[PDB]
Protein backbone atom coordinates (compact mmCIF):
# COMPACT_ATOMS: atom_id res chain seq x y z
CA UNK A 1 0.00 0.00 0.00
CA UNK A 2 2.48 2.59 1.25
CA UNK A 3 6.18 1.88 2.93
CA UNK A 4 8.73 4.39 4.05
CA UNK A 5 12.33 4.79 4.15
CA UNK A 6 14.21 8.39 5.51
CA UNK A 7 17.75 9.20 5.15
CA UNK A 8 20.07 11.46 6.92
CA UNK A 9 17.52 12.31 9.50
CA UNK A 10 18.05 12.60 13.27
CA UNK A 11 16.17 10.67 15.65
CA UNK A 12 14.71 13.95 16.91
CA UNK A 13 13.42 13.94 13.40
CA UNK A 14 12.58 10.59 13.09
CA UNK A 15 10.54 11.15 16.31
CA UNK A 16 8.07 12.56 13.31
CA UNK A 17 8.34 11.03 10.47
CA UNK A 18 7.75 7.86 12.71
CA UNK A 19 4.42 9.60 14.11
CA UNK A 20 3.29 10.93 11.02
CA UNK A 21 3.28 7.27 9.46
CA UNK A 22 1.95 6.23 12.79
CA UNK A 23 -1.04 8.48 12.10
CA UNK A 24 -1.90 7.69 8.45
CA UNK A 25 -1.25 3.90 8.87
CA UNK A 26 1.65 4.11 6.62
CA UNK A 27 4.48 1.10 7.02
CA UNK A 28 8.35 1.71 7.94
CA UNK A 29 11.70 0.44 7.07
CA UNK A 30 15.14 0.89 7.87
CA UNK A 31 16.34 -0.87 4.89
CA UNK A 32 15.24 0.72 1.37
CA UNK A 33 13.76 -3.11 -0.60
CA UNK A 34 11.91 -3.64 -3.54
CA UNK A 35 8.45 -3.11 -1.73
CA UNK A 36 9.39 0.58 -0.46
CA UNK A 37 7.52 3.44 -2.25
CA UNK A 38 8.66 6.22 -0.13
CA UNK A 39 12.08 7.58 0.55
CA UNK A 40 12.16 10.79 3.01
CA UNK A 41 15.47 13.40 2.44
CA UNK A 42 17.01 15.91 4.33
CA UNK A 43 17.18 19.07 2.88
CA UNK A 44 18.03 23.14 2.60
CA UNK A 45 14.24 24.65 1.56
CA UNK A 46 14.84 21.27 -1.55
CA UNK A 47 18.32 20.01 -2.15
CA UNK A 48 19.23 16.76 -0.55
CA UNK A 49 23.08 15.23 0.14
CA UNK A 50 23.52 12.22 -1.97
CA UNK A 51 22.71 9.06 0.17
CA UNK A 52 22.83 5.36 -0.93
CA UNK A 53 19.10 5.09 -0.57
CA UNK A 54 18.80 8.20 -2.43
CA UNK A 55 20.31 6.15 -5.62
CA UNK A 56 18.13 3.22 -4.76
CA UNK A 57 15.38 5.22 -4.47
CA UNK A 58 15.10 7.14 -7.83
CA UNK A 59 16.66 4.14 -9.40
CA UNK A 60 13.26 2.50 -8.06
CA UNK A 61 10.90 5.74 -9.43
CA UNK A 62 9.54 5.97 -5.90
CA UNK A 63 8.67 8.48 -4.23
CA UNK A 64 11.36 10.65 -3.41
CA UNK A 65 10.64 13.31 -1.33
CA UNK A 66 11.74 15.62 0.98
CA UNK A 67 11.56 16.15 4.84
CA UNK A 68 9.79 19.00 4.61
CA UNK A 69 6.64 17.06 3.00
CA UNK A 70 5.96 15.56 6.61
CA UNK A 71 6.45 18.53 9.08
CA UNK A 72 4.37 20.31 6.85
CA UNK A 73 1.65 17.41 7.05
CA UNK A 74 1.74 17.00 11.14
CA UNK A 75 1.08 21.13 10.95
CA UNK A 76 -2.06 20.90 8.53
CA UNK A 77 -3.65 17.77 9.83
CA UNK A 78 -2.97 16.48 6.92
CA UNK A 79 -1.28 14.20 4.56
CA UNK A 80 -0.26 16.38 1.55
CA UNK A 81 -0.09 14.92 -2.04
CA UNK A 82 3.82 13.77 -2.59
CA UNK A 83 3.33 15.49 -6.29
CA UNK A 84 4.22 18.61 -4.72
CA UNK A 85 7.06 17.57 -2.90
CA UNK A 86 10.33 15.48 -4.23
CA UNK A 87 14.06 16.68 -3.95
CA UNK A 88 16.24 18.27 -6.87
CA UNK A 89 19.55 17.35 -6.55
CA UNK A 90 22.49 18.28 -3.71
CA UNK A 91 26.23 18.53 -5.46
CA UNK A 92 25.57 16.56 -8.96
CA UNK A 93 22.45 18.34 -9.47
CA UNK A 94 22.38 21.87 -8.42
CA UNK A 95 18.42 22.88 -6.88
CA UNK A 96 18.72 23.24 -10.76
CA UNK A 97 18.54 19.47 -11.71
CA UNK A 98 15.66 17.20 -10.60
CA UNK A 99 16.35 13.95 -11.06
CA UNK A 100 13.48 11.91 -9.03
CA UNK A 101 11.40 13.71 -11.79
CA UNK A 102 12.42 11.74 -14.70
CA UNK A 103 12.56 8.69 -12.73
CA UNK A 104 8.94 8.30 -11.46
CA UNK A 105 7.74 9.46 -14.60
CA UNK A 106 9.37 7.63 -17.16
CA UNK A 107 10.14 3.68 -16.78
CA UNK A 108 8.18 2.48 -19.44
CA UNK A 109 11.51 3.24 -21.30
CA UNK A 110 14.58 3.11 -18.57
CA UNK A 111 17.72 4.92 -18.88
CA UNK A 112 19.82 1.48 -18.95
CA UNK A 113 17.58 0.01 -21.78
CA UNK A 114 20.22 -2.05 -23.57
CA UNK A 115 23.52 -2.02 -22.06
CA UNK A 116 25.90 -4.72 -20.15
CA UNK A 117 27.66 -3.26 -16.83
CA UNK A 118 30.19 -5.07 -14.83
CA UNK A 119 31.10 -3.07 -11.76
CA UNK A 120 34.70 -4.35 -12.45
CA UNK A 121 37.44 -5.54 -9.07
CA UNK A 122 37.09 -3.61 -5.48
CA UNK A 123 34.56 -0.92 -4.15
CA UNK A 124 34.00 0.26 -0.39
CA UNK A 125 31.40 3.43 -0.30
CA UNK A 126 28.80 2.15 -1.47
CA UNK A 127 29.61 -2.05 -2.36
CA UNK A 128 29.21 -3.81 -5.64
CA UNK A 129 25.61 -5.58 -5.10
CA UNK A 130 23.92 -2.53 -4.79
CA UNK A 131 25.87 -1.20 -7.34
CA UNK A 132 24.90 -3.98 -9.87
CA UNK A 133 21.02 -3.95 -8.29
CA UNK A 134 21.40 -0.05 -8.68
CA UNK A 135 21.99 -0.43 -12.81
CA UNK A 136 20.24 -3.51 -12.55
CA UNK A 137 16.88 -1.36 -11.18
CA UNK A 138 17.26 1.05 -14.21
CA UNK A 139 17.54 -2.31 -16.82
CA UNK A 140 21.40 -2.64 -17.64
CA UNK A 141 22.36 -6.12 -17.85
CA UNK A 142 24.97 -7.07 -15.20
CA UNK A 143 27.84 -9.25 -15.75
CA UNK A 144 30.24 -10.60 -13.38
CA UNK A 145 33.51 -11.19 -14.81
CA UNK A 146 35.23 -9.13 -18.08
CA UNK A 147 34.95 -12.55 -19.72
CA UNK A 148 31.10 -12.81 -20.02
CA UNK A 149 30.21 -9.74 -22.65
CA UNK A 150 27.64 -11.42 -24.83
CA UNK A 151 28.96 -8.87 -27.60
CA UNK A 152 26.78 -10.57 -30.13
CA UNK A 153 27.30 -7.18 -32.19
CA UNK A 154 23.54 -5.95 -30.84
CA UNK A 155 24.77 -4.97 -27.38
CA UNK A 156 26.69 -2.25 -25.51
CA UNK A 157 29.14 -3.27 -22.50
CA UNK A 158 30.68 -1.08 -20.20
CA UNK A 159 33.48 -2.32 -17.47
CA UNK A 160 32.81 0.29 -14.44
CA UNK A 161 35.56 0.67 -12.26
CA UNK A 162 36.10 2.42 -8.62
CA UNK A 163 39.37 3.69 -9.19
CA UNK A 164 40.77 4.23 -6.06
CA UNK A 165 39.63 1.16 -4.18
CA UNK A 166 42.55 -0.81 -5.25
CA UNK A 167 45.80 -0.02 -3.83
CA UNK A 168 47.99 0.14 -10.22
CA UNK A 169 46.28 -2.57 -13.04
CA UNK A 170 43.30 -1.07 -13.43
CA UNK A 171 44.77 0.77 -16.77
CA UNK A 172 45.27 -2.79 -18.36
CA UNK A 173 41.56 -3.68 -18.59
CA UNK A 174 41.24 -2.66 -22.03
CA UNK A 175 44.30 -5.14 -22.26
CA UNK A 176 40.98 -8.01 -21.84
CA UNK A 177 37.93 -6.88 -23.79
CA UNK A 178 36.45 -4.31 -25.92
CA UNK A 179 33.68 -2.09 -24.32
CA UNK A 180 34.92 0.74 -22.39
CA UNK A 181 36.33 1.54 -18.63
CA UNK A 182 34.02 4.20 -17.17
CA UNK A 183 34.19 5.24 -13.24
CA UNK A 184 32.34 4.46 -10.97
CA UNK A 185 30.48 8.05 -10.76
CA UNK A 186 29.67 7.81 -13.77
CA UNK A 187 26.48 5.49 -12.39
CA UNK A 188 26.15 8.08 -9.88
CA UNK A 189 25.83 10.88 -11.76
CA UNK A 190 23.48 9.23 -14.40
CA UNK A 191 21.42 7.72 -12.13
CA UNK A 192 21.06 11.16 -10.08
CA UNK A 193 19.98 13.27 -13.50
CA UNK A 194 18.51 9.95 -14.85
CA UNK A 195 19.74 11.05 -18.09
CA UNK A 196 22.18 8.61 -19.40
CA UNK A 197 25.56 10.48 -19.18
CA UNK A 198 28.33 10.68 -21.83
CA UNK A 199 31.25 8.56 -20.80
CA UNK A 200 33.60 11.37 -21.97
CA UNK A 201 34.76 12.65 -18.85
CA UNK A 202 34.36 9.52 -17.14
CA UNK A 203 36.97 7.19 -19.03
CA UNK A 204 39.82 5.70 -17.61
CA UNK A 205 43.48 5.21 -19.57
CA UNK A 206 43.66 2.31 -21.30
CA UNK A 207 46.83 1.13 -22.01
CA UNK A 208 48.01 -1.83 -24.60
CO1 LIG B 1 26.03 1.88 -30.33
Avoid at 49 to 62: D, M, Q, S, W
Wanted: hydrophobic residues 40%; aromatic residues 10%; proline residues 4%.
Amino acid sequence: RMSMVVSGLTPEEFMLVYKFARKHHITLTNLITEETTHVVMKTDAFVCERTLKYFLGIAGGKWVVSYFWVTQSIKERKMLNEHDFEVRGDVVNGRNHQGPKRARESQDRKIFRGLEICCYGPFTNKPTDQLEWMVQLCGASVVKELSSFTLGTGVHPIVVVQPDAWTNGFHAIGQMCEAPVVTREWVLDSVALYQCQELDTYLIPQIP
